[PDB]
Amino acid sequence: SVSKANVPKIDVSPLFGDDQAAKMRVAQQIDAASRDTGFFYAVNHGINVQRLSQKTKEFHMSITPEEKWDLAIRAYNKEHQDQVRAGYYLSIPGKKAVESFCYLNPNFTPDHPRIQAKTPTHEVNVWPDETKHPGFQDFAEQYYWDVFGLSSALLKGYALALGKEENFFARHFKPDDTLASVVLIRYPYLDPYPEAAIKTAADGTKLSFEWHEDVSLITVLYQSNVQNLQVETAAGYQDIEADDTGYLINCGSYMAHLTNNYYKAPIHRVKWVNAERQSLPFFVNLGYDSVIDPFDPREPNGKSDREPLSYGDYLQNGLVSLINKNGQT
Ligand SMILES: N[C@@H](CCCC(=O)N[C@@H](CS)C(=O)N[C@@H](C(=O)O)C1CC1)C(=O)O
Ligand SMILES: [Fe+2]
Q: Residue 2 and which of 66, 116, 214, 229 are 20 to 30 A apart at CA?
């Protein structure tokens, strides 16, 4: 068997309030989890995840092949050269099971200064036809802001955990410019399930997505109640329990950089499971020009021998590297 990973449930509700002592007690729990397996479940987060799941299912199960081409990123549709990040990521029946829809900051409109400048990693979202998907765009944009709010609260907790003032990360995480993305991933049930869509780990475990560290500051994830994730620990890969009432939180490699690996970006992978399910990550990314000076909370003077890295540089390079390592999703 595989051992169960320690993934504590942390009540994050004080991070929305003004009880500073209570916030510190939450920060300590985040610190402990970040130093152990690198994962925890945020509970009492205030988001209606059942409705998120229902609206997402309605979208995934009603979108047609025609609409998928019309929304497709450039990896699938050469006509859409502006769509590197945002849009539809098609399955390939017989070869690739997973499919998804990615969207970015709703404030990236045609008149946004970064859109006008054609700055890398900024795109205007594409949406299906409103008549075919009534309410979907509005729901999805509102969801972005709901999970942005949770993420801002979580970032106050991580800042306090690291010995900083609570706005240390959040001051770089702003509605007008965040590079954060939502991805609505569908993992299908298939009978037969094509072997070409199943990868195999060195230890023999059947996978849908190989080992990686996240390209993010933190990752704020909702998934269906079907166990699939594993995290590498000193004791080997361990199973992360599912919990479709909470958000699974972990650090990405930008956090590891900024903290000199005090909070590591945990290595994790996705087991192959033949089940119809949802994986709905929010990747907490800062602004394109955001730079936090690296530090080390294990060193008396707090100094680090790492060089500052702008978030835009980090992100553009990280997303390409992840595609090169683990394949186009
Ligand atoms: N397209 C997105 C980035 C996608 C990065 C990516 O492919 N991530 C993987 C590894 S974290 C991913 O989303 N995998 C999901 C899965 O396979 O279920 C995860 C975290 C829920 C953007 O432009 O921001
Ligand atoms: Fe990941």
A: 214
